[PDB]
Motif scaffolding. Sequence first.
Motif, PDB file in Angstrom:
ATOM      1  N   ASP A 106       0.804  -1.202   0.000  1.00  0.00           N
ATOM      2  CA  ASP A 106       0.000   0.000   0.000  1.00  0.00           C
ATOM      3  C   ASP A 106       0.835   1.249   0.000  1.00  0.00           C
ATOM      4  N   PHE A 107       0.348   2.280  -0.678  1.00  0.00           N
ATOM      5  CA  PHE A 107       1.003   3.576  -0.686  1.00  0.00           C
ATOM      6  C   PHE A 107      -0.070   4.462  -0.077  1.00  0.00           C
ATOM      7  N   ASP A 108       0.136   4.807   1.188  1.00  0.00           N
ATOM      8  CA  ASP A 108      -0.784   5.601   1.969  1.00  0.00           C
ATOM      9  C   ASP A 108      -0.351   7.034   2.082  1.00  0.00           C
ATOM     10  N   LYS A 109      -1.323   7.934   1.901  1.00  0.00           N
ATOM     11  CA  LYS A 109      -1.164   9.384   1.964  1.00  0.00           C
ATOM     12  C   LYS A 109      -2.092   9.958   3.030  1.00  0.00           C
ATOM     13  N   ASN A 110      -1.584  10.274   4.205  1.00  0.00           N
ATOM     14  CA  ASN A 110      -2.439  10.860   5.227  1.00  0.00           C
ATOM     15  C   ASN A 110      -3.770  10.152   5.336  1.00  0.00           C
ATOM     16  N   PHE A 111      -3.761   8.849   5.089  1.00  0.00           N
ATOM     17  CA  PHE A 111      -4.977   8.080   5.148  1.00  0.00           C
ATOM     18  C   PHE A 111      -4.616   6.624   5.221  1.00  0.00           C
ATOM     19  N   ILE A 112      -5.257   5.899   6.132  1.00  0.00           N
ATOM     20  CA  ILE A 112      -5.012   4.466   6.301  1.00  0.00           C
ATOM     21  C   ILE A 112      -5.499   3.621   5.121  1.00  0.00           C
ATOM     22  N   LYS A 113      -6.429   4.183   4.353  1.00  0.00           N
ATOM     23  CA  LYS A 113      -6.980   3.539   3.155  1.00  0.00           C
ATOM     24  C   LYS A 113      -5.994   3.941   2.035  1.00  0.00           C
ATOM     25  N   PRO A 114      -5.382   2.957   1.334  1.00  0.00           N
ATOM     26  CA  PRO A 114      -4.432   3.300   0.281  1.00  0.00           C
ATOM     27  C   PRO A 114      -4.890   4.131  -0.891  1.00  0.00           C
ATOM     28  N   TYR A 115      -3.938   4.910  -1.379  1.00  0.00           N
ATOM     29  CA  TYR A 115      -4.134   5.766  -2.529  1.00  0.00           C
ATOM     30  C   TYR A 115      -4.033   4.928  -3.798  1.00  0.00           C
ATOM     31  N   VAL A 116      -3.155   3.949  -3.728  1.00  0.00           N
ATOM     32  CA  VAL A 116      -2.855   3.032  -4.811  1.00  0.00           C
ATOM     33  C   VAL A 116      -2.284   1.831  -4.061  1.00  0.00           C
ATOM     34  N   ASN A 117      -2.754   0.640  -4.397  1.00  0.00           N
ATOM     35  CA  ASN A 117      -2.287  -0.567  -3.735  1.00  0.00           C
ATOM     36  C   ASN A 117      -2.075  -1.596  -4.811  1.00  0.00           C
ATOM     37  N   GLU A 118      -1.157  -2.519  -4.570  1.00  0.00           N
ATOM     38  CA  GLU A 118      -0.853  -3.577  -5.527  1.00  0.00           C
ATOM     39  C   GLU A 118      -0.693  -4.890  -4.777  1.00  0.00           C
ATOM     40  N   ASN A 119      -1.314  -5.939  -5.284  1.00  0.00           N
ATOM     41  CA  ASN A 119      -1.227  -7.254  -4.649  1.00  0.00           C
ATOM     42  C   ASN A 119       0.192  -7.828  -4.670  1.00  0.00           C
ATOM     43  N   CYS A 120       0.622  -8.397  -3.546  1.00  0.00           N
ATOM     44  CA  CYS A 120       1.962  -8.981  -3.455  1.00  0.00           C
ATOM     45  C   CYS A 120       1.811 -10.128  -2.485  1.00  0.00           C
ATOM     46  N   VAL A 152      10.302 -13.800  -6.870  1.00  0.00           N
ATOM     47  CA  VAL A 152       9.071 -13.036  -7.154  1.00  0.00           C
ATOM     48  C   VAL A 152       9.304 -11.510  -6.944  1.00  0.00           C
ATOM     49  N   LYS A 153       8.663 -10.682  -7.783  1.00  0.00           N
ATOM     50  CA  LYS A 153       8.736  -9.192  -7.789  1.00  0.00           C
ATOM     51  C   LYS A 153       7.350  -8.536  -7.617  1.00  0.00           C
ATOM     52  N   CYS A 154       7.308  -7.379  -6.969  1.00  0.00           N
ATOM     53  CA  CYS A 154       6.079  -6.606  -6.820  1.00  0.00           C
ATOM     54  C   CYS A 154       6.534  -5.196  -6.951  1.00  0.00           C
ATOM     55  N   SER A 155       5.607  -4.318  -7.323  1.00  0.00           N
ATOM     56  CA  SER A 155       5.907  -2.904  -7.491  1.00  0.00           C
ATOM     57  C   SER A 155       4.647  -2.112  -7.670  1.00  0.00           C
ATOM     58  N   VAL A 156       4.694  -0.846  -7.283  1.00  0.00           N
ATOM     59  CA  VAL A 156       3.552   0.035  -7.486  1.00  0.00           C
ATOM     60  C   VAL A 156       4.136   1.384  -7.786  1.00  0.00           C
ATOM     61  N   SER A 157       3.345   2.210  -8.443  1.00  0.00           N
ATOM     62  CA  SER A 157       3.763   3.555  -8.755  1.00  0.00           C
ATOM     63  C   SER A 157       2.593   4.482  -8.493  1.00  0.00           C
ATOM     64  N   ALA A 158       2.897   5.691  -8.041  1.00  0.00           N
ATOM     65  CA  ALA A 158       1.857   6.682  -7.792  1.00  0.00           C
ATOM     66  C   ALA A 158       2.478   8.022  -8.079  1.00  0.00           C
ATOM     67  N   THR A 159       1.621   9.005  -8.345  1.00  0.00           N
ATOM     68  CA  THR A 159       2.056  10.374  -8.598  1.00  0.00           C
ATOM     69  C   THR A 159       1.702  11.129  -7.315  1.00  0.00           C
ATOM     70  N   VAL A 160       2.742  11.653  -6.667  1.00  0.00           N
ATOM     71  CA  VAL A 160       2.597  12.366  -5.399  1.00  0.00           C
ATOM     72  C   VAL A 160       3.371  13.643  -5.443  1.00  0.00           C
ATOM     73  N   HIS A 161       2.868  14.582  -4.651  1.00  0.00           N
ATOM     74  CA  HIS A 161       3.461  15.890  -4.463  1.00  0.00           C
ATOM     75  C   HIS A 161       3.796  15.836  -3.001  1.00  0.00           C
ATOM     76  N   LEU A 162       4.949  15.266  -2.691  1.00  0.00           N
ATOM     77  CA  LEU A 162       5.365  15.139  -1.311  1.00  0.00           C
ATOM     78  C   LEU A 162       5.100  16.401  -0.509  1.00  0.00           C
ATOM     79  N   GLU A 163       5.531  17.539  -1.064  1.00  0.00           N
ATOM     80  CA  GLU A 163       5.393  18.874  -0.460  1.00  0.00           C
ATOM     81  C   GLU A 163       4.003  19.225   0.011  1.00  0.00           C
TER      82      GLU A 163
END
Length: 228
Positions: free
Chosen positions: A132-146, A180-191
């Motif tokens: 999971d890639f979480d942004k100020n939220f416990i519910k993921p912004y983008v998640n990928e099965n692994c 085995v490999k897993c990966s996810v990508s998201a567009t974030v504005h860290l700032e």
Amino acid sequence: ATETSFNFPNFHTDDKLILQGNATISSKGQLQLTGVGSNELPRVDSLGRAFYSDPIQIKDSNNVASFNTNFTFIIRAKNQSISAYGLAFALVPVNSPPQKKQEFLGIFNTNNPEPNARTVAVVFNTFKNRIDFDKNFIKPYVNENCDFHKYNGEKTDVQITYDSSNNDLRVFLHFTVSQVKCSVSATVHLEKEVDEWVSVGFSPTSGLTEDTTETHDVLSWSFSSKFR
Ligand SMILES: *[C@@H]1O[C@H](CO)[C@@H](O[C@@H]2O[C@H](CO)[C@@H](O)[C@H](O)[C@H]2NC(C)=O)[C@H](O[C@@H]2O[C@@H](C)[C@@H](O)[C@@H](O)[C@@H]2O)[C@H]1NC(C)=O
């Protein structure tokens, strides 16, 4: 200084690290996030976090830092099929104390958005079996099965990059023997999610039972922020 860079080929007590909750460094030089009890068995319902002691600068003013972090870990469970909860690489407010346990991975408090958590995390959700890639939220912004239930129990190499130019976060996980490999990508504005200076590190939570618990050990870690 705006640019940070460190390298832990292994861990030791005298290191630049802040350990919170049940996290400890083992005699072998391993960062044991959720800890081990008096009988040397994984702790149940345990939370441990650990951050590089120096705060990292994300926003210089107008320029945002790009960063590259590589780390390798092992999660060992009595029954991985029912293991919980996972390990997190997170950017948090500088002296933030651990939040809630369980599925909150010690980085969040609610099922609701926490814009003021000022946290951005990549969770290796061993409970739900995904990244999971979480942004100020416990519910993921983008998640990928692994498939952690299946491939855990072996060194797993993680690599996380953030390019402020295209504002993209990329996570590449590689289970070293199963290959085995897993990966996810998201567009974030860290700032827009974290403060100008943040604490960098990990946070894991273990299950509420001898069967559901597991270890979350980090065996190595490197980091490099860069202002281009
Ligand atoms: C650190 O490891 C301990 C287990 O080895 C955790 O304590 C356990 O917490 C459970 C509730 O979360 C409780 O029902 C268990 O009986 C208890 N076990 C023991 C040996 O204390 C500890 O959690 C903290 O300490 C306990 C005593 C409670 O006060 C909890 O509220 C605390 O979170 C683990 N987690 C942390 C963050 O220390």
